[PDB]
Design a binder for this molecule. Structure first.
Ligand SMILES: CCCO[C@@H]1O[C@H](CO)[C@@H](O[C@@H]2O[C@H](CO)[C@H](O)[C@H](OCc3cn(C)nn3)[C@H]2O)[C@H](O)[C@H]1NC(C)=O
Ligand SMILES: CCCO[C@@H]1O[C@H](CO)[C@@H](O[C@@H]2O[C@H](CO)[C@H](O)[C@H](OCc3cn(C)nn3)[C@H]2O)[C@H](O)[C@H]1NC(C)=O
Lengths: 133, 133
Protein backbone atom coordinates (compact mmCIF):
# COMPACT_ATOMS: atom_id res chain seq x y z
CA UNK A 1 0.00 0.00 0.00
CA UNK A 2 3.16 2.18 0.21
CA UNK A 3 6.14 2.65 -2.06
CA UNK A 4 7.48 -0.49 -3.82
CA UNK A 5 10.90 -0.48 -5.39
CA UNK A 6 12.77 -3.08 -7.42
CA UNK A 7 16.15 -3.37 -9.09
CA UNK A 8 17.70 -1.76 -6.03
CA UNK A 9 21.01 -3.63 -6.64
CA UNK A 10 22.12 -3.22 -3.03
CA UNK A 11 25.32 -5.23 -2.44
CA UNK A 12 27.06 -6.35 0.75
CA UNK A 13 28.43 -3.49 2.81
CA UNK A 14 26.47 -0.82 0.95
CA UNK A 15 24.06 1.36 2.93
CA UNK A 16 20.39 1.85 2.15
CA UNK A 17 18.96 4.90 4.00
CA UNK A 18 15.16 5.21 4.14
CA UNK A 19 13.48 8.26 5.63
CA UNK A 20 9.75 8.49 6.09
CA UNK A 21 6.84 9.81 8.10
CA UNK A 22 5.20 7.76 10.83
CA UNK A 23 1.48 8.53 10.70
CA UNK A 24 0.17 10.39 13.79
CA UNK A 25 -2.30 7.58 14.58
CA UNK A 26 0.29 4.90 13.90
CA UNK A 27 -0.33 1.39 15.18
CA UNK A 28 2.20 -0.50 13.02
CA UNK A 29 4.37 -0.03 9.98
CA UNK A 30 6.36 -2.33 7.74
CA UNK A 31 9.46 -2.14 5.61
CA UNK A 32 10.12 -5.32 3.59
CA UNK A 33 13.46 -6.03 1.92
CA UNK A 34 14.63 -8.97 -0.16
CA UNK A 35 14.88 -10.51 -3.61
CA UNK A 36 11.18 -10.00 -4.41
CA UNK A 37 7.85 -9.98 -2.61
CA UNK A 38 8.01 -13.72 -1.82
CA UNK A 39 11.65 -13.85 -0.72
CA UNK A 40 12.29 -11.38 2.10
CA UNK A 41 15.52 -11.06 4.02
CA UNK A 42 13.89 -8.60 6.32
CA UNK A 43 10.28 -8.00 7.20
CA UNK A 44 10.83 -5.09 9.61
CA UNK A 45 7.65 -4.42 11.60
CA UNK A 46 7.58 -1.85 14.41
CA UNK A 47 4.36 -2.41 16.34
CA UNK A 48 3.15 0.49 18.45
CA UNK A 49 -0.05 -1.38 19.36
CA UNK A 50 -0.85 -4.25 16.99
CA UNK A 51 -1.20 -8.05 16.67
CA UNK A 52 -0.75 -8.37 20.41
CA UNK A 53 2.39 -6.26 20.85
CA UNK A 54 3.11 -2.86 22.38
CA UNK A 55 6.21 -0.86 21.38
CA UNK A 56 8.03 -3.87 19.95
CA UNK A 57 9.87 -4.37 16.68
CA UNK A 58 9.09 -7.75 15.13
CA UNK A 59 11.37 -9.06 12.41
CA UNK A 60 10.99 -12.04 10.16
CA UNK A 61 12.10 -13.56 6.86
CA UNK A 62 10.01 -15.07 4.05
CA UNK A 63 11.38 -17.88 1.92
CA UNK A 64 9.47 -18.92 -1.22
CA UNK A 65 6.27 -17.52 0.30
CA UNK A 66 6.71 -19.13 3.71
CA UNK A 67 7.18 -16.95 6.78
CA UNK A 68 10.10 -17.80 9.03
CA UNK A 69 10.31 -17.60 12.78
CA UNK A 70 9.76 -14.14 14.25
CA UNK A 71 12.44 -12.38 16.25
CA UNK A 72 11.46 -9.66 18.70
CA UNK A 73 13.87 -6.82 19.39
CA UNK A 74 14.63 -5.09 22.68
CA UNK A 75 14.54 -1.45 21.52
CA UNK A 76 11.93 0.89 20.09
CA UNK A 77 13.02 4.44 19.13
CA UNK A 78 9.87 5.34 17.19
CA UNK A 79 7.02 7.75 18.09
CA UNK A 80 3.75 8.19 16.16
CA UNK A 81 3.50 11.32 14.03
CA UNK A 82 7.23 11.90 13.58
CA UNK A 83 9.92 11.45 10.96
CA UNK A 84 12.08 8.33 11.18
CA UNK A 85 15.17 7.17 9.30
CA UNK A 86 16.26 3.51 9.10
CA UNK A 87 19.61 2.49 7.60
CA UNK A 88 20.31 -1.00 6.45
CA UNK A 89 23.39 -2.92 5.39
CA UNK A 90 24.04 -6.64 5.09
CA UNK A 91 26.80 -9.21 4.76
CA UNK A 92 27.10 -13.00 4.51
CA UNK A 93 25.92 -13.50 8.08
CA UNK A 94 23.61 -10.65 9.10
CA UNK A 95 21.60 -7.62 8.21
CA UNK A 96 22.49 -4.67 10.38
CA UNK A 97 19.61 -2.28 10.99
CA UNK A 98 20.46 1.18 12.36
CA UNK A 99 17.61 3.12 13.92
CA UNK A 100 17.07 6.61 15.33
CA UNK A 101 18.81 7.70 18.54
CA UNK A 102 21.84 5.46 18.13
CA UNK A 103 20.06 2.10 18.36
CA UNK A 104 20.89 -0.82 16.12
CA UNK A 105 20.38 -4.56 15.90
CA UNK A 106 21.32 -7.52 13.72
CA UNK A 107 19.04 -10.05 12.05
CA UNK A 108 20.52 -13.22 10.51
CA UNK A 109 20.78 -13.39 6.71
CA UNK A 110 18.66 -16.53 6.62
CA UNK A 111 18.23 -16.66 2.84
CA UNK A 112 21.96 -16.16 2.24
CA UNK A 113 21.20 -13.26 -0.08
CA UNK A 114 24.13 -11.65 -1.86
CA UNK A 115 22.03 -8.73 -3.17
CA UNK A 116 18.90 -6.91 -2.05
CA UNK A 117 16.76 -5.93 -5.04
CA UNK A 118 13.29 -5.30 -3.56
CA UNK A 119 11.85 -2.97 -0.98
CA UNK A 120 8.27 -2.21 -0.01
CA UNK A 121 6.63 -0.05 2.65
CA UNK A 122 3.19 -0.70 4.13
CA UNK A 123 1.21 0.57 7.10
CA UNK A 124 1.75 3.89 8.79
CA UNK A 125 5.07 4.81 7.09
CA UNK A 126 5.22 7.25 4.14
CA UNK A 127 8.63 7.09 2.47
CA UNK A 128 10.04 10.54 1.70
CA UNK A 129 13.61 9.74 0.67
CA UNK A 130 15.66 6.69 -0.33
CA UNK A 131 19.37 7.05 -0.60
CA UNK A 132 22.16 4.66 -1.58
CA UNK A 133 25.66 4.93 -0.17
CA UNK B 1 17.68 -1.92 -16.23
CA UNK B 2 17.69 0.39 -13.24
CA UNK B 3 15.52 1.32 -10.30
CA UNK B 4 11.76 0.86 -10.73
CA UNK B 5 9.41 2.39 -8.18
CA UNK B 6 5.64 2.00 -8.03
CA UNK B 7 2.88 3.28 -5.76
CA UNK B 8 4.57 6.66 -5.76
CA UNK B 9 1.27 8.55 -5.43
CA UNK B 10 2.94 11.76 -6.57
CA UNK B 11 0.18 14.36 -6.65
CA UNK B 12 0.02 17.56 -8.70
CA UNK B 13 2.44 20.17 -7.43
CA UNK B 14 4.56 17.72 -5.43
CA UNK B 15 8.23 17.49 -6.39
CA UNK B 16 10.08 14.31 -7.36
CA UNK B 17 13.87 14.68 -7.08
CA UNK B 18 16.31 12.14 -8.52
CA UNK B 19 20.09 12.39 -8.17
CA UNK B 20 22.42 10.06 -10.07
CA UNK B 21 25.91 9.61 -11.44
CA UNK B 22 26.28 9.91 -15.21
CA UNK B 23 28.71 7.24 -16.43
CA UNK B 24 32.08 8.56 -17.72
CA UNK B 25 31.34 6.98 -21.13
CA UNK B 26 27.59 7.58 -21.02
CA UNK B 27 25.64 7.29 -24.24
CA UNK B 28 22.06 7.77 -22.95
CA UNK B 29 19.84 7.48 -19.89
CA UNK B 30 16.12 7.37 -19.38
CA UNK B 31 13.76 8.37 -16.65
CA UNK B 32 10.21 7.18 -17.31
CA UNK B 33 7.30 8.48 -15.29
CA UNK B 34 3.64 7.61 -15.46
CA UNK B 35 1.15 4.96 -14.37
CA UNK B 36 2.98 1.85 -15.54
CA UNK B 37 5.32 0.74 -18.27
CA UNK B 38 2.65 1.21 -21.01
CA UNK B 39 1.41 4.61 -19.83
CA UNK B 40 4.13 7.25 -19.45
CA UNK B 41 3.34 10.89 -19.06
CA UNK B 42 7.08 11.53 -19.46
CA UNK B 43 9.85 9.56 -21.13
CA UNK B 44 12.89 11.74 -20.42
CA UNK B 45 15.90 10.64 -22.49
CA UNK B 46 19.14 12.64 -22.52
CA UNK B 47 21.16 11.32 -25.46
CA UNK B 48 24.87 12.04 -25.21
CA UNK B 49 25.65 10.00 -28.33
CA UNK B 50 22.77 7.67 -29.18
CA UNK B 51 20.29 7.18 -32.05
CA UNK B 52 22.33 9.55 -34.21
CA UNK B 53 21.81 12.35 -31.67
CA UNK B 54 24.48 14.25 -29.76
CA UNK B 55 23.89 16.14 -26.52
CA UNK B 56 20.13 16.30 -27.02
CA UNK B 57 17.29 15.72 -24.58
CA UNK B 58 14.50 13.73 -26.23
CA UNK B 59 11.12 13.61 -24.53
CA UNK B 60 7.94 11.68 -25.40
CA UNK B 61 4.80 10.18 -23.90
CA UNK B 62 3.42 6.64 -24.17
CA UNK B 63 -0.32 6.08 -24.03
CA UNK B 64 -1.67 2.55 -23.93
CA UNK B 65 1.58 1.28 -25.42
CA UNK B 66 1.72 3.89 -28.21
CA UNK B 67 4.55 6.38 -28.34
CA UNK B 68 3.43 9.95 -28.83
CA UNK B 69 5.03 12.77 -30.80
CA UNK B 70 8.65 13.22 -29.76
CA UNK B 71 10.02 16.61 -28.81
CA UNK B 72 13.59 17.78 -28.39
CA UNK B 73 14.94 20.45 -26.07
CA UNK B 74 17.54 23.09 -26.79
CA UNK B 75 19.88 22.82 -23.73
CA UNK B 76 21.92 19.87 -22.47
CA UNK B 77 23.07 20.50 -18.90
CA UNK B 78 24.68 17.07 -18.37
CA UNK B 79 28.30 15.96 -18.55
CA UNK B 80 29.59 12.36 -18.64
CA UNK B 81 31.36 11.47 -15.41
CA UNK B 82 29.44 13.79 -13.13
CA UNK B 83 26.53 13.86 -10.74
CA UNK B 84 23.23 15.33 -11.87
CA UNK B 85 19.91 16.06 -10.19
CA UNK B 86 16.57 16.14 -11.99
CA UNK B 87 13.43 17.59 -10.34
CA UNK B 88 9.97 17.00 -11.76
CA UNK B 89 6.51 18.32 -10.96
CA UNK B 90 3.24 18.34 -12.87
CA UNK B 91 -0.24 19.84 -13.15
CA UNK B 92 -3.02 18.90 -15.60
CA UNK B 93 -1.44 21.00 -18.37
CA UNK B 94 2.29 20.28 -18.18
CA UNK B 95 5.11 18.51 -16.52
CA UNK B 96 7.87 20.90 -15.41
CA UNK B 97 11.40 19.47 -15.56
CA UNK B 98 14.11 21.34 -13.66
CA UNK B 99 17.69 20.42 -14.49
CA UNK B 100 21.21 21.49 -13.52
CA UNK B 101 22.70 24.84 -14.54
CA UNK B 102 19.37 26.57 -13.92
CA UNK B 103 17.62 25.06 -16.94
CA UNK B 104 13.92 24.27 -16.82
CA UNK B 105 11.36 23.24 -19.46
CA UNK B 106 7.74 22.10 -19.71
CA UNK B 107 6.46 19.02 -21.55
CA UNK B 108 2.71 18.73 -22.24
CA UNK B 109 0.82 16.34 -19.98
CA UNK B 110 -0.88 14.20 -22.65
CA UNK B 111 -2.29 11.53 -20.31
CA UNK B 112 -5.01 12.12 -17.74
CA UNK B 113 -3.32 10.67 -14.67
CA UNK B 114 -4.60 11.69 -11.24
CA UNK B 115 -1.14 10.94 -9.82
CA UNK B 116 2.24 9.75 -11.05
CA UNK B 117 2.60 6.28 -9.58
CA UNK B 118 5.50 4.76 -11.55
CA UNK B 119 9.09 5.69 -12.26
CA UNK B 120 11.73 3.59 -14.00
CA UNK B 121 15.32 4.49 -14.64
CA UNK B 122 17.49 2.93 -17.32
CA UNK B 123 20.79 3.50 -18.99
CA UNK B 124 23.99 5.21 -18.03
CA UNK B 125 22.81 6.93 -14.82
CA UNK B 126 23.36 5.36 -11.37
CA UNK B 127 20.68 6.55 -8.96
CA UNK B 128 21.99 7.76 -5.64
CA UNK B 129 18.91 9.38 -4.13
CA UNK B 130 15.21 9.73 -4.76
CA UNK B 131 13.06 12.14 -2.77
CA UNK B 132 9.32 12.88 -2.75
CA UNK B 133 9.23 16.44 -1.36
C1 LIG C 1 -3.40 -13.80 16.35
C2 LIG C 1 -2.08 -13.37 16.89
C3 LIG C 1 -1.35 -13.74 18.15
O1 LIG C 1 -0.30 -14.34 17.30
C4 LIG C 1 0.26 -13.49 16.05
O2 LIG C 1 -0.23 -14.09 14.73
C5 LIG C 1 -0.16 -13.05 13.71
C6 LIG C 1 -0.60 -13.63 12.36
O3 LIG C 1 0.31 -14.66 11.96
C7 LIG C 1 1.27 -12.56 13.62
O4 LIG C 1 1.28 -11.45 12.74
C8 LIG C 1 1.81 -11.58 11.42
O5 LIG C 1 3.25 -11.63 11.53
C9 LIG C 1 3.86 -11.62 10.23
C10 LIG C 1 5.36 -11.49 10.24
O6 LIG C 1 5.78 -12.60 11.09
C11 LIG C 1 3.42 -10.35 9.50
O7 LIG C 1 3.86 -9.21 10.32
C12 LIG C 1 1.94 -10.22 9.31
O8 LIG C 1 1.64 -8.91 8.73
C13 LIG C 1 1.88 -8.86 7.31
C14 LIG C 1 1.92 -7.40 6.81
C15 LIG C 1 1.52 -6.31 7.46
N1 LIG C 1 1.75 -5.29 6.63
C16 LIG C 1 1.47 -3.85 6.90
N2 LIG C 1 2.26 -5.75 5.56
N3 LIG C 1 2.39 -7.01 5.62
C17 LIG C 1 1.34 -10.31 10.70
O9 LIG C 1 -0.10 -10.29 10.64
C18 LIG C 1 1.71 -12.03 14.96
O10 LIG C 1 3.12 -11.70 14.93
C19 LIG C 1 1.55 -13.05 16.10
N4 LIG C 1 1.67 -12.27 17.34
C20 LIG C 1 2.24 -12.77 18.44
C21 LIG C 1 2.74 -14.21 18.34
O11 LIG C 1 2.39 -12.13 19.48
C1 LIG D 1 9.91 9.92 -33.93
C2 LIG D 1 9.76 8.91 -35.01
C3 LIG D 1 10.81 8.36 -35.97
O1 LIG D 1 12.27 8.62 -35.79
C4 LIG D 1 13.02 7.75 -34.85
O2 LIG D 1 12.50 6.48 -34.41
C5 LIG D 1 13.19 5.86 -33.28
C6 LIG D 1 12.35 4.62 -32.94
O3 LIG D 1 10.95 4.95 -32.92
C7 LIG D 1 13.25 6.84 -32.10
O4 LIG D 1 13.91 6.24 -30.98
C8 LIG D 1 13.00 5.97 -29.92
O5 LIG D 1 12.55 7.22 -29.34
C9 LIG D 1 11.63 6.94 -28.27
C10 LIG D 1 11.11 8.17 -27.60
O6 LIG D 1 10.41 8.83 -28.67
C11 LIG D 1 12.32 6.14 -27.17
O7 LIG D 1 13.47 6.92 -26.65
C12 LIG D 1 12.83 4.83 -27.71
O8 LIG D 1 13.59 4.15 -26.71
C13 LIG D 1 12.76 3.60 -25.69
C14 LIG D 1 13.68 2.77 -24.80
C15 LIG D 1 14.11 1.55 -25.08
N1 LIG D 1 14.89 1.24 -24.05
C16 LIG D 1 15.63 -0.04 -23.86
N2 LIG D 1 14.91 2.23 -23.23
N3 LIG D 1 14.20 3.16 -23.65
C17 LIG D 1 13.73 5.12 -28.89
O9 LIG D 1 14.15 3.89 -29.52
C18 LIG D 1 13.98 8.10 -32.52
O10 LIG D 1 14.01 9.00 -31.42
C19 LIG D 1 13.13 8.69 -33.62
N4 LIG D 1 13.52 10.02 -34.13
C20 LIG D 1 14.77 10.39 -34.40
C21 LIG D 1 14.86 11.82 -34.95
O11 LIG D 1 15.77 9.70 -34.22
Amino acid sequence: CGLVASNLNLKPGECLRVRGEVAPDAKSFVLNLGKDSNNLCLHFNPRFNAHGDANTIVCNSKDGGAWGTEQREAVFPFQPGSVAEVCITFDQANLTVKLPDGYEFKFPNRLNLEAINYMAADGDFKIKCVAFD
